[PDB]
Amino acid sequence: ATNFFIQPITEEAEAYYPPSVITNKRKDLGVDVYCCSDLVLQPGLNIVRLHIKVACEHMGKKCGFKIMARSSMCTHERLLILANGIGLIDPGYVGELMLKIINLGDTPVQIWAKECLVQLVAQGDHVPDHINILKRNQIFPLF
Amino acid sequence: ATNFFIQPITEEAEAYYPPSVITNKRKDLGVDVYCCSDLVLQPGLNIVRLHIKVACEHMGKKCGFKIMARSSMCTHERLLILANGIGLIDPGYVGELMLKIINLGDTPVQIWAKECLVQLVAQGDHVPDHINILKRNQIFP
Amino acid sequence: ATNFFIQPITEEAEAYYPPSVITNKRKDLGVDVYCCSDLVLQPGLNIVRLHIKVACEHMGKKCGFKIMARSSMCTHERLLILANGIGLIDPGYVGELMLKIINLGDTPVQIWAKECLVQLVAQGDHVPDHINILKRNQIFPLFAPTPR
Ligand SMILES: O=c1ccn([C@H]2C[C@H](O)[C@@H](COP(=O)(O)O)O2)c(=O)[nH]1
Ligand SMILES: O=c1ccn([C@H]2C[C@H](O)[C@@H](COP(=O)(O)O)O2)c(=O)[nH]1
Ligand SMILES: O=c1ccn([C@H]2C[C@H](O)[C@@H](COP(=O)(O)O)O2)c(=O)[nH]1
């Protein structure tokens, strides 16, 4: 099996990540993840904090995962790309998930809290079975 | 085994995709796909229809795949990138493939139908064994 | 197991890649890789040679790998992206590894030889066990019977 573990680490993040076990019955490859707060993306590089700590596991072992833009991220009203193409998250990383987004236009772009600009893909592109939303301040499960 | 299934939608796409079975003797990871139409990429974002329906399978079961730019897509004369970095195609997706291409230059760029700007990589990067080009008016296996 | 093999080509690449076997105790997915030469990235597309020969193997067989930008490659001061998003390296490729880097800014950007702008990831995202830095005068492995 392949499972994700997402823990909100701020107040605004808790509103979008209440404790739950989410099943991927549609069997999509990506796990959508929220902005959790309104933000304005200036032209050029923007550092976006996702306000979550994430773990991925495959066959009982902690693995890495990848951050990929959703197709909806770039539109005619927002010329947005992920600076690093895809974000490579190593299994040893236990910090907060971050995004480097380049606004390629000359116009600042308003992003809303509920929007999901990116999705998480497990190492090896394995379909996630469950997305476990952990409680804030809890210790992550052992793998 | 890992196999791709490509079905042309338009008459022009059928010209570039006649029914056949292509073998991946070189053992390449990506499956180059034609644009299947001449097109002009305006500066900024461009929505490009590939005029094909694609399914990927791994060990008898339908799987997802990924759309990746080819090295030749970007040159000194055309600054083209895929807007989403790589396209993530879920196994449940059954519609026509599409590309979001950003022309970073200030002048329109002409692309020919025979050009392969992008390649398809199976979920998990499994190397394809066969690329099945299907007839236009049939249903997927 | 999954292992990478790196052989420097130029003199300065040899200075950055002396013979050694690097173990991936952190179990990181990416293998950081040096520029091996000072370079100036002009606005627009830049074709960059990595000055190394690279192979990846998985369960005794040669496999492909992927070139991914590191998070450190793009900063507020240098707007650098990989033109193809990620570089897909087929196992047959054996030639020298190339980069297509777009400088999105209006002024040239200086990169130092010691900087690691990109990282290599094995086919299927398998975590590498060892990273073998080969001498310039030793045989590069083929991982297969000599074909045809
Ligand atoms: O888009 C990204 C890329 C990386 N990281 C974190 C997780 C990685 O383990 C660590 C190192 O990333 P790189 O330097 O290898 O890109 O930074 C992110 O939070 N977001
Ligand atoms: O480049 C792309 C990316 C996605 N899709 C289709 C297939 C996916 O299943 C669906 C959703 O993609 P995301 O929103 O997850 O990127 O859109 C494309 O046609 N082209
Ligand atoms: O960033 C890249 C991408 C590709 N290649 C080489 C290795 C591949 O086997 C070959 C074909 O690449 P594509 O045309 O499939 O992108 O070019 C590189 O050196 N660097």
Coordinates of C-alpha atoms in Angstrom, one line a residue, chain B:
Chain B
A1 CA 4.5 -5.6 -19.7
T2 CA 4.0 -1.9 -20.2
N3 CA 2.0 -0.8 -23.3
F4 CA 0.7 2.4 -24.7
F5 CA -2.5 2.8 -26.8
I6 CA -2.8 5.8 -29.1
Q7 CA -6.0 6.5 -31.0
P8 CA -6.2 9.5 -33.4
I9 CA -9.3 11.6 -33.2
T10 CA -9.0 13.8 -36.4
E11 CA -8.3 12.9 -40.0
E12 CA -5.0 14.7 -39.9
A13 CA -4.0 12.8 -36.7
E14 CA -4.9 9.5 -38.5
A15 CA -2.5 10.5 -41.3
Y16 CA 0.3 10.6 -38.7
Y17 CA -1.1 7.6 -36.7
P18 CA -2.1 4.8 -39.1
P19 CA -3.0 1.5 -37.4
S20 CA 0.2 -0.4 -36.4
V21 CA 2.1 -1.8 -33.5
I22 CA 5.4 0.0 -32.7
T23 CA 8.1 -1.8 -30.7
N24 CA 10.5 0.0 -28.4
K25 CA 13.7 -1.7 -29.4
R26 CA 15.9 1.2 -28.3
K27 CA 14.4 0.8 -24.7
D28 CA 13.6 4.5 -24.5
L29 CA 11.6 5.7 -21.5
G30 CA 9.4 8.2 -23.5
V31 CA 7.0 7.8 -26.3
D32 CA 7.3 10.7 -28.7
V33 CA 3.9 12.0 -29.9
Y34 CA 3.1 14.2 -32.9
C35 CA 1.5 17.6 -32.8
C36 CA -0.8 16.3 -35.6
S37 CA -1.5 19.8 -36.8
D38 CA 0.4 22.9 -37.8
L39 CA 0.0 25.5 -35.0
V40 CA 1.2 29.0 -34.1
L41 CA 2.2 29.5 -30.5
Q42 CA 1.4 33.0 -29.3
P43 CA 3.5 34.7 -26.6
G44 CA 2.3 33.6 -23.3
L45 CA 0.1 30.6 -22.5
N46 CA -1.2 28.3 -25.3
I47 CA -3.7 25.5 -25.0
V48 CA -2.8 22.8 -27.5
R49 CA -4.9 19.8 -28.4
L50 CA -3.0 16.7 -29.3
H51 CA -5.9 15.2 -31.3
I52 CA -5.2 11.8 -29.7
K53 CA -6.7 9.7 -26.9
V54 CA -4.0 7.8 -25.0
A55 CA -4.3 4.9 -22.5
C56 CA -1.3 3.2 -20.7
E57 CA -1.4 -0.2 -19.1
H58 CA 1.0 -2.0 -16.8
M59 CA 0.6 -5.8 -16.1
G60 CA -2.9 -6.0 -17.6
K61 CA -4.2 -3.1 -15.6
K62 CA -4.8 0.5 -16.8
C63 CA -2.3 2.9 -15.3
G64 CA -1.4 6.6 -15.4
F65 CA 1.4 8.3 -17.4
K66 CA 3.3 11.6 -17.6
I67 CA 3.7 14.2 -20.3
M68 CA 7.3 15.4 -20.5
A69 CA 8.9 18.0 -22.8
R70 CA 11.5 16.7 -25.2
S71 CA 14.9 18.4 -25.2
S72 CA 14.3 19.7 -28.8
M73 CA 11.1 21.5 -27.7
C74 CA 13.1 24.5 -26.5
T75 CA 15.7 26.1 -28.8
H76 CA 17.4 29.5 -29.2
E77 CA 14.8 30.4 -31.7
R78 CA 11.8 29.3 -29.7
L79 CA 11.6 29.6 -25.9
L80 CA 8.9 27.0 -25.2
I81 CA 8.1 25.3 -21.9
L82 CA 5.4 23.1 -20.5
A83 CA 3.4 25.3 -18.0
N84 CA 2.9 22.5 -15.5
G85 CA 6.5 21.2 -15.7
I86 CA 5.2 17.7 -16.4
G87 CA 1.7 16.6 -17.2
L88 CA 0.2 14.1 -14.7
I89 CA -2.4 11.9 -16.5
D90 CA -4.5 9.8 -14.1
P91 CA -5.5 6.3 -15.1
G92 CA -9.2 7.3 -14.9
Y93 CA -8.7 10.0 -17.5
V94 CA -10.3 9.0 -20.8
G95 CA -10.5 12.3 -22.7
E96 CA -8.2 13.8 -25.4
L97 CA -4.7 14.8 -24.3
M98 CA -3.9 18.5 -24.1
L99 CA -0.8 20.6 -23.5
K100 CA -0.3 23.9 -21.8
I101 CA 2.7 25.5 -23.6
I102 CA 4.2 28.9 -22.6
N103 CA 5.9 30.8 -25.3
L104 CA 8.4 32.9 -23.3
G105 CA 9.4 34.9 -26.4
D106 CA 7.8 38.0 -27.8
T107 CA 7.1 36.7 -31.3
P108 CA 4.7 33.9 -32.4
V109 CA 6.4 30.5 -33.0
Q110 CA 5.4 28.2 -35.9
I111 CA 5.2 24.4 -35.1
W112 CA 4.8 21.7 -37.8
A113 CA 2.4 18.8 -37.5
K114 CA 5.2 16.2 -37.7
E115 CA 7.1 17.7 -34.8
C116 CA 7.2 15.9 -31.5
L117 CA 7.5 18.5 -28.8
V118 CA 6.7 16.1 -25.9
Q119 CA 6.9 12.5 -24.9
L120 CA 4.8 10.1 -22.7
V121 CA 6.3 8.3 -19.8
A122 CA 4.4 5.5 -18.0
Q123 CA 3.6 5.7 -14.3
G124 CA 6.7 4.6 -12.4
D125 CA 8.9 5.2 -15.5
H126 CA 8.4 1.7 -16.8
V127 CA 9.9 1.3 -20.3
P128 CA 7.2 0.7 -22.9
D129 CA 7.3 -2.6 -24.8
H130 CA 4.6 -1.9 -27.5
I131 CA 3.0 1.3 -28.7
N132 CA -0.4 0.2 -30.2
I133 CA -1.8 2.7 -32.8
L134 CA -5.5 2.1 -32.9
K135 CA -8.1 2.7 -35.6
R136 CA -10.1 5.8 -35.2
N137 CA -13.6 4.4 -34.9
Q138 CA -13.0 1.7 -32.3
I139 CA -13.2 1.4 -28.5
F140 CA -10.3 0.9 -26.1
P141 CA -9.6 -2.7 -24.9

